[PDB]
Amino acid sequence: GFSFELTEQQKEFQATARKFAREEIIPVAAEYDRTGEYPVPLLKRAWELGLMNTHIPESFGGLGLGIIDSCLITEELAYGCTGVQTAIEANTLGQVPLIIGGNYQQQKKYLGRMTEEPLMCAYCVTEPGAGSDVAGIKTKAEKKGDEYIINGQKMWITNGGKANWYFLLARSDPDPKAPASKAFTGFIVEADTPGVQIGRKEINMGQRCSDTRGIVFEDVRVPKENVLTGEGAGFKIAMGTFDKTRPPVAAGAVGLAQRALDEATKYALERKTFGKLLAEHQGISFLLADMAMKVELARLSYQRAAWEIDSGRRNTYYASIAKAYAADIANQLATDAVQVFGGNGFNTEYPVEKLMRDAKIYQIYEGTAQIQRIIIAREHIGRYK
Amino acid sequence: GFSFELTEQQKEFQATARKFAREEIIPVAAEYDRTGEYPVPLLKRAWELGLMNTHIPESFGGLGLGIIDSCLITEELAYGCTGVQTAIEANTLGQVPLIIGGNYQQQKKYLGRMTEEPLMCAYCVTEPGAGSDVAGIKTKAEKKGDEYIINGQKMWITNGGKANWYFLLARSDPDPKAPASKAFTGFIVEADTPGVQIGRKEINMGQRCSDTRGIVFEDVRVPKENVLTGEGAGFKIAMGTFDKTRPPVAAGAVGLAQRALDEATKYALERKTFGKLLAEHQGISFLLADMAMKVELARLSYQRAAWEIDSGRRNTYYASIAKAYAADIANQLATDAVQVFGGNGFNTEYPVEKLMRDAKIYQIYEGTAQIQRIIIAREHIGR
Amino acid sequence: GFSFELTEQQKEFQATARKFAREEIIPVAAEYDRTGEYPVPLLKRAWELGLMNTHIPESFGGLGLGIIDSCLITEELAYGCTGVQTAIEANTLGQVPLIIGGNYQQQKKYLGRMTEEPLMCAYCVTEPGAGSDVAGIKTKAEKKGDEYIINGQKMWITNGGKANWYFLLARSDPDPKAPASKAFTGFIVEADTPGVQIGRKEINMGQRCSDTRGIVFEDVRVPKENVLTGEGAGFKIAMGTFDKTRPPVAAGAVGLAQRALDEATKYALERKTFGKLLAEHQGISFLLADMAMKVELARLSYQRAAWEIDSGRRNTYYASIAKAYAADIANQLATDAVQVFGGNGFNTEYPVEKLMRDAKIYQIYEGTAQIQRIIIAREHIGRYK
Amino acid sequence: GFSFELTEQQKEFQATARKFAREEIIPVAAEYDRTGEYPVPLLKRAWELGLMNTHIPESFGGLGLGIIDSCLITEELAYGCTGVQTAIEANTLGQVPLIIGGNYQQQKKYLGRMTEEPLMCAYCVTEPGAGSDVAGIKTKAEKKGDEYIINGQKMWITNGGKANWYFLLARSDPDPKAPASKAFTGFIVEADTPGVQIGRKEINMGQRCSDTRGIVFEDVRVPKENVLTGEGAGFKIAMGTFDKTRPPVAAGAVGLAQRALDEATKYALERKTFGKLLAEHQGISFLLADMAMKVELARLSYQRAAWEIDSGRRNTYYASIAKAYAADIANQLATDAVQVFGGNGFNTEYPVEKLMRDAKIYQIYEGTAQIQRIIIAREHIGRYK
Ligand SMILES: CCCCCSCC(=O)SCCNC(=O)CCNC(=O)[C@H](O)C(C)(C)COP(=O)(O)OP(=O)(O)OC[C@H]1O[C@@H](n2cnc3c(N)ncnc32)[C@H](O)[C@@H]1OP(=O)(O)O
Ligand SMILES: CCCCCSCC(=O)SCCNC(=O)CCNC(=O)[C@H](O)C(C)(C)COP(=O)(O)OP(=O)(O)OC[C@H]1O[C@@H](n2cnc3c(N)ncnc32)[C@H](O)[C@@H]1OP(=O)(O)O
Ligand SMILES: CCCCCSCC(=O)SCCNC(=O)CCNC(=O)[C@H](O)C(C)(C)COP(=O)(O)OP(=O)(O)OC[C@H]1O[C@@H](n2cnc3c(N)ncnc32)[C@H](O)[C@@H]1OP(=O)(O)O
Ligand SMILES: CCCCCSCC(=O)SCCNC(=O)CCNC(=O)[C@H](O)C(C)(C)COP(=O)(O)OP(=O)(O)OC[C@H]1O[C@@H](n2cnc3c(N)ncnc32)[C@H](O)[C@@H]1OP(=O)(O)O
Ligand SMILES: Cc1cc2nc3c(=O)[nH]c(=O)nc-3n(C[C@H](O)[C@H](O)[C@H](O)COP(=O)(O)OP(=O)(O)OC[C@H]3O[C@@H](n4cnc5c(N)ncnc54)[C@H](O)[C@@H]3O)c2cc1C
Ligand SMILES: Cc1cc2nc3c(=O)[nH]c(=O)nc-3n(C[C@H](O)[C@H](O)[C@H](O)COP(=O)(O)OP(=O)(O)OC[C@H]3O[C@@H](n4cnc5c(N)ncnc54)[C@H](O)[C@@H]3O)c2cc1C
Ligand SMILES: Cc1cc2nc3c(=O)[nH]c(=O)nc-3n(C[C@H](O)[C@H](O)[C@H](O)COP(=O)(O)OP(=O)(O)OC[C@H]3O[C@@H](n4cnc5c(N)ncnc54)[C@H](O)[C@@H]3O)c2cc1C
Ligand SMILES: Cc1cc2nc3c(=O)[nH]c(=O)nc-3n(C[C@H](O)[C@H](O)[C@H](O)COP(=O)(O)OP(=O)(O)OC[C@H]3O[C@@H](n4cnc5c(N)ncnc54)[C@H](O)[C@@H]3O)c2cc1C
């Protein structure tokens, strides 16, 4: 029947991820946000504390956990700082294409080193001209003998200048008439090969400690043994990846929303106005209630989406719903938390202005709020005929 | 482990309820809404179909179903007509106070009689001067011999004019500072007793075939044997009830929303404007997506609150979140369903305007949206 | 300079409409909502009290008033019952096409008799298969000598079976490739002419006492003397009628909204729960404040739309904003008004459940919420190019 | 009657501030934001152009303008940067207390020096333990002979470390049971006085170039001739000031919102996805339309609030609504302007992310969002008794 209970093993990872978040990530989050420095120390702890590369099949050294677990751990991380969390989750995002679109050797080779040493990887789809419109990417790949020459630009790549290797999507069919399901190719490209030119670190409003940047691929030579499933199967792999990784993303948002809620509540029991605590004012009580309600509902949506794909079924529908809802309520709670703090909440000495800045990104990456509505609409309507 | 899978027994109960709603409730819900006559026929078919009193334990002829099971059946019902469905649920609301508060006799006596024949009971707590402030009711009760003389009135009682027996909250202690947790007493009262003056059928905006009205009690006499757990445990029996009834009530609102969503979606795939199908205009697509999203979230919220109580764990927190949310998105989905229909949506010859009129009630009874907030804040600032 | 002051004369019109609405309309609107009976008695009294046909030029016996004036009166009327008000304001809608699109003769004939006798007229554009898309209408008009043969059907026509004459829009050019600006013609059709088959009174959830029904035109022969400006200038006239007529509609929703606010406001100061008036519960205070806020803002927007057209400038941008907003908040206050009444609110013995039923239509007729956004988006974006 | 036409004079002011704003503020706004450096060059410049101290009576060298005028000017300014505009507007805030509560001598002395040289002043009410609850301030003032000894702490003071003179609200009656309308007194304090300790500069999320800080007052001696109207008239002077300064703060929000709307529009007319310009996608056009709708309504509201006070009528009701609404729609428009920009919108190399960090303050200062509801609710209930 129905069950919202956790296995004893899951309650274990959760306790571990939680401790690590409230004891290690939280005391340093404020400083990494200010200095925009890559959180190398924290990424190593998470590595030896088994909180990273969770999805890598144990057939290569991984724990072989499932999307339910990734979300479970990720929510505890995001609670500390989604900046560190995004860098961590970026690894899963880049690995997944290999897990569902790669052969044994490719996984043994690129996934195996991830469990052996604390390396990082990245997902390369987005370009300057196209992001939401994946079908419009212009980065190319031509075959020369047993190789592929790759030329193009990638923009906004997470872990972009810190990855050992990259998952790269490039158009292989020059014919403009070529359909999306046959014009692209997923390649696994090592970062040190001659031709990849890493750009500068972009400076964004939130998740500052995270490394995000552009990359130029100029006459990059990739050996044929590096094409994932085959020339022309890149798009499906890309789509499959998003369904697998959108749930954990949505989980990151609820993690951020939780943080907002706890802060808002803690302060609401300390500050007094007109003779009573902020929480004793019905106005504020309803605000707090409406916040809690939303975090619970967003957590349910991602659990449902994770479970679905984990059970082996296509979860595009539930996945998008969770991403959309969690993203929107993550922002709503971020600003309401700042709100109950009054002037103090607008100040950097307090923890909430950072939350409002980190939150905006959830409505944009891994499919914007709009694109998610296009997906949900296309799946919902497909059911009526 | 995590699971959102229904058991074969539930995929069976559900198939039955869905059939009863799609094929039998839906082709007549329209006329019952217009006329407003208590849909006795449908209530007989529900009963003899197992879809009623679904909570009475086997020991008395009932199926002894759980809260999760009850919500799965309700959603399918409401999807047809929340008017008919509310008639049905008003039954388990009058029953639960007996299941959780009454002794074997009382239970065998009044619950057993419900499995033998298609009878109806009612829950009487609300009065004219108090609905939300449940601790403020005035219906009195004074003991005399092995009897309690009850005096007072109630209002908005569902199945009030169609009930065999009533669960009834009255104030036993006449002391002002009497601690709420000892000032009230619950009673299972029979409709045929002297002094029970039933009122006219109250006419409302939605859920019109349902029976709702005021009941005045004047010197009604109740034998101490009908006093539920004991003289004074009233407030506790009444409160403990909500923890079981709220989940189903939210699943009802979700069924309505599911119906509205379906109607609007089919129409959008039929009506054409500007050389395009309504569903092809990005503006409408987004509307549809947001509606889908809200239905799926409201559904999960009640499943969570049900599973919580079915597990023996107190579920006030999750229950109120499901009730609060489901009520809101049911009203929002009703108005948007009317919106996609256009002029037709505003018309009586179409199915959507009824939904909009029905929905509104979910924000009012069984604890208003405002009261649901007060509870969610109390429980949250409690964890 | 800026002024939100009413001229002494406008202060008079308002006081008339107000008294009329609160002493004569309110006392009987509930029965009319029930019976669905045309409110002839109230229309008669509205006519003599000078509250109707407000826009007809003095040249033809009218008050010569303007849109700002037309709105001030409507809001007061709507406060009583938008069912009655929509019946009255429908006359204005049907009259505008003549006032801005006809010659002296046409205006003397049809506009003139409205000042002498309490007749009613109607606006016939919407068909069963095309409403939001006026360029979609399929009722044709054919030139047979010095006459026009009209054939087609119209749906949802206010004052549809109570009108003396009708303004009708019919495609006059069969060429499917013909521009909408050149393919239509507006006519003036007298109801008694042979061929006009009036349908049944339609039953609706709200504004129940207003006459709204379908109408078929079977070989109706209208004289060229009744063509508005010319053959092919019908689309512009209608577009021009909406900008002029949309503001009063908005002012109409503001009336309904103001009514809801008062009812709820008067109850909240009466009903007591948990030992306090509803009003003393901050949760309800804030609720009331938001309603007040929305009504004030909606009132301001229709005033800005009336002034713009009254100053001789095309007011499309402003009319749409006012209509869209007033409609959205008129619906929001209806359900919140029912909400503060609680149980009673859902009962037909209390005035608010009717408000909720009447309100929904403001988001549909005279341009649906969605179309308003299209128009607004068109006006706004044109200013950057 | 009704008018929405600017007098030829206001059209001049407006055109000047617009020019100054789009060609002098905008070009350097991003830099002052990144450094948080106080914009002295722009302030001296504004003072030169007459876009400052606008409300000072002309018999003191001032323009003698009104609130509506201040709102017209502030909106243009805020459009360039609400960081720069807040520094300017904070001057009016500090001056009003003298305008409505000081005698002739005090005004020529303090308001006079402002017109002769580009000085700055501040408003001192908020303390660290009380902001919304003005009646809860602890700063004490006692009368010793012909002077008052001031002791207390203030916090979040705009222009706090750049003021020549301060308006200070202190409690002059130790009797805790004394009414709020009799326990405070407003003093005008010179910053160079012994005992005034300026705090460091506080670092906030938005309006970073604005100067804001706390200030300690150790036994600050103040001549009795510096008491504004008299002992105990402090609450009313402060309350009276907020009614006049609330419309302007609201106008600042609609300026920031207008800036958001323009950037969003211009980008939607350039960025291309799925073969069309963003503005071509209906989901996006609808968003732009709603954004446009709010700005027009927010602007309309502060216009109504300014006009009511210039006319010599208590405008508490209208001021709070305009302030409450503009505040919200500014935050809504900010985050949605970032949305249309995509990943770019989240990047600091673009103008929108700054607009989002700045907008959040409008729901906090000059009376928080919740406090405005308390006022609107009360004024509203007052109309039913
Ligand atoms: C915290 C963790 C770290 C994260 C750090 S940030 C990381 C990142 O941001 S990664 C970048 C994210 N990129 C996006 O979200 C892009 C959003 N766009 C899309 O998803 C799609 O282009 C779209 C808009 C949905 C689709 O557009 P279309 O071009 O129109 O494709 P279609 O025509 O719909 O379909 C073409 C074929 O693909 C098949 N398809 C579509 N969806 C799916 C799914 N979900 N699974 C499998 N196959 C799919 C479709 O069936 C078509 O196939 P045919 O066989 O030809 O019929
Ligand atoms: C599908 C449709 C079918 C048709 C259905 S029509 C049927 C109906 O509409 S229901 C009848 C109408 N009545 C209502 O809606 C009441 C709504 N509830 C409320 O508003 C309550 O005031 C409240 C807000 C919930 C509570 O307010 P309070 O006055 O402040 O009391 P509490 O503090 O909650 O409780 C005090 C004592 O109650 C006990 N308690 C509290 N929570 C619980 C739970 N969860 N389980 C059991 N007991 C509980 C508690 O023990 C307190 O007493 P003690 O002194 O500790 O013994
Ligand atoms: C009073 C209360 C009591 C009674 C209450 S109930 C009464 C009623 O319901 S009456 C029924 C109302 N019907 C509607 O609201 C329909 C809404 N749809 C529309 O407004 C238009 O189709 C549209 C969506 C705006 C336009 O769609 P399009 O087909 O795409 O036309 P466009 O391409 O935009 O324009 C084509 C030409 O028309 C000209 N045009 C458009 N707007 C105007 C205005 N405002 N003035 C002048 N001309 C206008 C446009 O310029 C085009 O022509 P050109 O050749 O370029 O000159
Ligand atoms: C763009 C510019 C650049 C700089 C930007 S940053 C600038 C700033 O931040 S300035 C600081 C802002 N702080 C605030 O806005 C705080 C909001 N709080 C309040 O307004 C009031 O405390 C309140 C909540 C409305 C009232 O609370 P109460 O304590 O409960 O007072 P009351 O008991 O309601 O009333 C007490 C007496 O005062 C009288 N009163 C109230 N309002 C008014 C007005 N508007 N005019 C005159 N008198 C007023 C009221 O009548 C009471 O009178 P009695 O004589 O005592 O009977
Ligand atoms: C911090 C950060 C980290 C990132 N990390 C990665 C990474 O690791 N790997 C990676 O591949 N990418 C990454 N990205 C890129 C991100 O996934 C893309 O930037 C985003 O999906 C790109 O879309 P766009 O910016 O082109 O937006 P566009 O959508 O093209 O334009 C902006 C607006 O257009 C709207 N829009 C577009 N098309 C439509 C339509 N048809 N209908 C309605 N609305 C529409 C969008 O909703 C949006 O609001 C990152 C971005 C950021 C900011
Ligand atoms: C950049 C900046 C510049 C400033 N400049 C100035 C200046 O020049 N002069 C000046 O005097 N002040 C200034 N301030 C201070 C501003 O006016 C105050 O910060 C604000 O009014 C302070 O409220 P608070 O921070 O104490 O909030 P508090 O309200 O005390 O606490 C936070 C929360 O409590 C809620 N709350 C409080 N009471 C109630 C109630 N009864 N009912 C419901 N909700 C309630 C609030 O809505 C809020 O969300 C500035 C602040 C900032 C951030
Ligand atoms: C169709 C229908 C069927 C019904 N069937 C039954 C039945 O079978 N049995 C039964 O017992 N009752 C029944 N009722 C009654 C329903 O349970 C009550 O109407 C509802 O709980 C009554 O509250 P009230 O109307 O007294 O509202 P009150 O709340 O007293 O007053 C109206 C408003 O006050 C607000 N409010 C009250 N207190 C507070 C507070 N402290 N803070 C903030 N806001 C507050 C509420 O949210 C509400 O909007 C039925 C009602 C309807 C409409
Ligand atoms: C009580 C009443 C009185 C009336 N009186 C009159 C009268 O006197 N004269 C008269 O002429 N008409 C009258 N009407 C008709 C009213 O003007 C029309 O019903 C309405 O404009 C018709 O549109 P539709 O119903 O065909 O809508 P349709 O648009 O066909 O369908 C409704 C849905 O489609 C959406 N939609 C359509 N096109 C698009 C698009 N391109 N993009 C996004 N969404 C879109 C709409 O927004 C809406 O939600 C009346 C209607 C009613 C209910």
Domain boundaries, chain D: 1-120, 121-241, 242-385
Contact C285 D377 (CB under 8 A): yes
Suggest the residue from B286, B287, B288, B339 to mutate for an interface test with chain D (most D CBs closer than 10 A).
B286
Q: Are D240 and D191 spatial neighbours (Cβ–Cβ below 8 Å)?
A: no
Transcribe A119-169 into DSSP letters.
--EEEE---SS-SS-GGG---EEEEETTEEEEEEEEEEEETTTT-SEEEEE
Contact C133 B363 (CB under 8 A): no
Q: Alpha-carbon distance B259 to B267, whole Å?
A: 12
Residue B324 CA from chain centroid, whole number: 14
Q: Which residues contact C190 (CB under 8 A, 6 or more apart)?
A: C164, C165, C166
Tokens of C37: 């009976």
Q: Are D307 and D68 spatial neighbours (Cβ–Cβ below 8 Å)?
A: yes
Mention the CATH class of domain B121-241. mainly beta
Transcribe B11-59 into DSSP letters.
HHHHHHHHHIIIIIITTTHHHHHHH----HHHHHHHHTTT-SSTTS-GG
Taking the CA atoms of residue A186, residue A188, residue A192 and residue A197 in that order, the dihedral angle to the nearest 10 degrees is 20
Q: Are C273 and C341 spatial neighbours (Cβ–Cβ below 8 Å)?
A: no
Q: Are A229 and A56 spatial neighbours (Cβ–Cβ below 8 Å)?
A: no
Taking the CA atoms of residue B361, residue B365, residue B367 and residue B371 in that order, the dihedral angle to the nearest 10 degrees is 50
Contact D283 B282 (CB under 8 A): yes
Give the DSSP H or E segment for D151.
Answer: strand D147-158
Those of residues 288-347 in D touching chain C at CB distance below 8 A are 288-290, 292-293, 296-297, 300-301, 303-304, 306-308, 318, 321, 324-325
Residue A157 labelled as part of a binding site: yes
Helix (H, G, I), strand (E, B) or coil at D197: strand
Inter-residue long-range contacts of D236-240, CB under 8 Å, 24+ positions, other chains counted: D236/D181, D237/D97, D237/D100, D237/D101, D237/D186, D238/D97, D238/D125, D238/D134, D238/D169, D238/D184, D238/D186, D240/D96, D240/D100, D240/D101
Among A75, A231, A308, A366, which one carries the catalytic annotation? A366
Which chains have 3 or more CB–CB distances shorter than 8 Å to chain B? Answer: A, C, D
Cβ burial, residue B257 (10 Å; 0-12/13-18/19+): buried
Question: Which experimental method was this entry solved with?
Answer: X-ray
Q: Alpha-carbon distance B271 to B276, whole Å?
A: 9
Q: Are B236 and B179 spatial neighbours (Cβ–Cβ below 8 Å)?
A: no
List the beta bridge partners of residue B141. B150
Task: Specify whether domain B242-383 bears CATH 2.60.120.10.
Answer: no
Q: Alpha-carbon distance C257 to D37, whole Å?
A: 48
Which atom of ligand 4 is least distant from the CA of D132?
A: 16
Cβ burial, residue A58 (10 Å; 0-12/13-18/19+): exposed
Q: Are A258 and A75 spatial neighbours (Cβ–Cβ below 8 Å)?
A: yes
Which atom of ligand 2 is least distant from the CA of B74?
A: 1
CB atoms within 10 A of CB D144: 10
Q: Alpha-carbon distance A164 to A122, whole Å?
A: 8
The topology (CATH level 3) of D242-385 is Butyryl-CoA Dehydrogenase, subunit A; domain 3 (1.20.140)
Q: Are A186 and A109 spatial neighbours (Cβ–Cβ below 8 Å)?
A: no
Ligand 8 centre and the CA of B278: distance in Å?
12
- CA angle, C93 as apex, C92 and C94 as ends, to 5°? 90
A351 lines ligand 1 (CB under 6 A): no
Q: Alpha-carbon distance C41 to B199, whole Å?
A: 35
Ligand 8 centre and the CA of C362: distance in Å?
11
Q: What's the longest Cα–Cα distance across chain A?
A: 80
User: Smallest Cβ distance to A204: which of D348, D369, D373?
Assistant: D348
Ligand 5 centre and the CA of B291: distance in Å?
24
Give strand ranges (E) for B77-129: 121-124
User: Smallest Cβ distance to C300: which of D5, D300, D374?
Assistant: D300
Helices (H), C102-224: 104-106, 112-116, 180-183
> Which residue, judged by its Cα, is nearest atom 7 of ligand 3?
C366
Which residues have CB under 6 Å of ligand 8? B 271, 273-274, 278, 281, 283-284, 339-340, 342-343, 346; C 90, 122-123, 125-126, 131-132, 156-158, 204, 207, 212, 361, 364-365, 368, 370-371
Helices (H), chain C: 8-19, 26-35, 40-48, 67-80, 82-101, 104-106, 112-116, 180-183, 234-268, 282-310, 316-341, 352-359, 369-382
Q: Are B372 and B363 spatial neighbours (Cβ–Cβ below 8 Å)?
A: no
Q: Are D143 and D172 spatial neighbours (Cβ–Cβ below 8 Å)?
A: yes
* Residue A204, φ and ψ in degrees, nearest 5: -105, 175
Inform me whether the C-beta atom of residue D281 falls under 8 Å from chain B C-beta atoms. yes
Nearest in space to B161 (alpha carbons), one of B220, B111, B93, B216: B216
Q: Which residues contact B358 (CB under 8 A, 6 or more apart)?
A: B81, B82, B83, B206, B207, B256, B334
Q: Give the position of tokens 């006219």.
A: B200
Q: Are D319 and D379 spatial neighbours (Cβ–Cβ below 8 Å)?
A: no
Give strand ranges (E) for A236-383: 272-273, 276-277
Q: Alpha-carbon distance B95 to A288, whole Å?
A: 34
In single-letter form, the type of residue at position B139 comes to T
Contact A348 D205 (CB under 8 A): yes
Q: Which residues in B lie closer than 8 A to residue D288 (C-beta atoms)?
A: none
Q: Give the position of tokens 């506790």.
A: B236
Exposure of A267 in the CB half-sphere (CA atoms within 13 A): 21
User: Smallest Cβ distance to A289: which of B265, B318, B377?
Assistant: B377
Ligand 5 pocket test, pick from D278, D344, D348, D349 with the greatest ligand atom count within 8 Å of Cβ, gives: D278
Q: Are D54 and D244 spatial neighbours (Cβ–Cβ below 8 Å)?
A: no
Q: Which residues in D lie closer than 8 A to residue B285 (C-beta atoms)?
A: 283
Q: Alpha-carbon distance B362 to B251, whole Å?
A: 11
Those of residues 1-30 in B touching chain A at CB distance below 8 A are 1-7, 10
Contact D360 A203 (CB under 8 A): no
Q: Alpha-carbon distance D383 to D378, whole Å?
A: 9
> Which residue, judged by its Cα, is nearest atom 36 of ligand 6?
A278
Nearest in space to A76 (alpha carbons), one of A20, A138, A154: A20
CB atoms within 10 A of CB C275: 8
Q: Which residues contact A20 (CB under 8 A, 6 or more apart)?
A: A45, A46, A49, A51, A76, A77, A80
Q: Give the position of tokens 């291309």.
A: D272
| CA-based nearest distance D111→chain B, Å | 50
Residue C246 labelled as part of a binding site: yes
Give the DSSP H or E segment for D148.
Answer: strand D147-158
Helix (H, G, I), strand (E, B) or coil at B152: strand
List the beta bridge partners of residue A204. D347
Q: What's the helix, strand, coil split of chain D in %, to 5?
A: 55, 15, 30
Give this entry's resolution in angstroms.
2.4
Taking the CA atoms of residue D291, residue D297, residue D303 and residue D305 in that order, the dihedral angle to the nearest 10 degrees is -120
Q: Do domains B121-241 and B242-383 have the same CATH topology?
A: no
Q: Are B304 and A300 spatial neighbours (Cβ–Cβ below 8 Å)?
A: yes
Q: Alpha-carbon distance D141 to D154, whole Å?
A: 14
A316 lines ligand 1 (CB under 6 A): yes
Contact C353 B204 (CB under 8 A): yes
The per-type count for chain C, helices as H runs and strands as E runs, is 13, 10
Inform me whether the C-beta atom of residue C269 falls under 8 Å from chain D C-beta atoms. yes
Annotated binding site of D: 123-132, 156-158, 181, 243, 246, 271-273, 281-282, 314, 316, 339-343, 366-370
Which atom of ligand 4 is least distant from the CA of D252?
A: 1
Q: Alpha-carbon distance C265 to C253, whole Å?
A: 18
Q: Alpha-carbon distance D82 to D75, whole Å?
A: 9
Q: Alpha-carbon distance B257 to B297, whole Å?
A: 11
Q: How far is CA A337 from CA A333, A348, C123, in A?
A: 6, 14, 52
Q: Are A344 and A350 spatial neighbours (Cβ–Cβ below 8 Å)?
A: yes
Taking the CA atoms of residue A32, residue A33, residue A34 and residue A37 in that order, the dihedral angle to the nearest 10 degrees is 50
Q: Are D343 and A156 spatial neighbours (Cβ–Cβ below 8 Å)?
A: yes
Mention the CATH class of domain B1-120. mainly alpha
Helix (H, G, I), strand (E, B) or coil at D380: helix
Q: Which residues in C lie closer than 8 A to residue D325 (C-beta atoms)?
A: 293, 297
Nearest in space to D296 (alpha carbons), one of D248, D254, D253: D254
* Residue B223, φ and ψ in degrees, nearest 5: -75, 135
Contact B2 A3 (CB under 8 A): yes
Tokens of B248: 């189903």
Q: Are B75 and B252 spatial neighbours (Cβ–Cβ below 8 Å)?
A: yes
- CA angle, A170 as apex, A169 and A172 as ends, to 5°? 135
* Residue B115, φ and ψ in degrees, nearest 5: -90, -15
Inform me whether the C-beta atom of residue A275 falls under 8 Å from chain C C-beta atoms. no
Q: Are C366 and C246 spatial neighbours (Cβ–Cβ below 8 Å)?
A: yes
Helix (H, G, I), strand (E, B) or coil at B214: strand
Q: Are A319 and A303 spatial neighbours (Cβ–Cβ below 8 Å)?
A: no
Cβ burial, residue D92 (10 Å; 0-12/13-18/19+): buried
Tokens of A273: 């106005």
Residue A80 labelled as part of a binding site: no
Residue C358 CA from chain centroid, whole number: 13
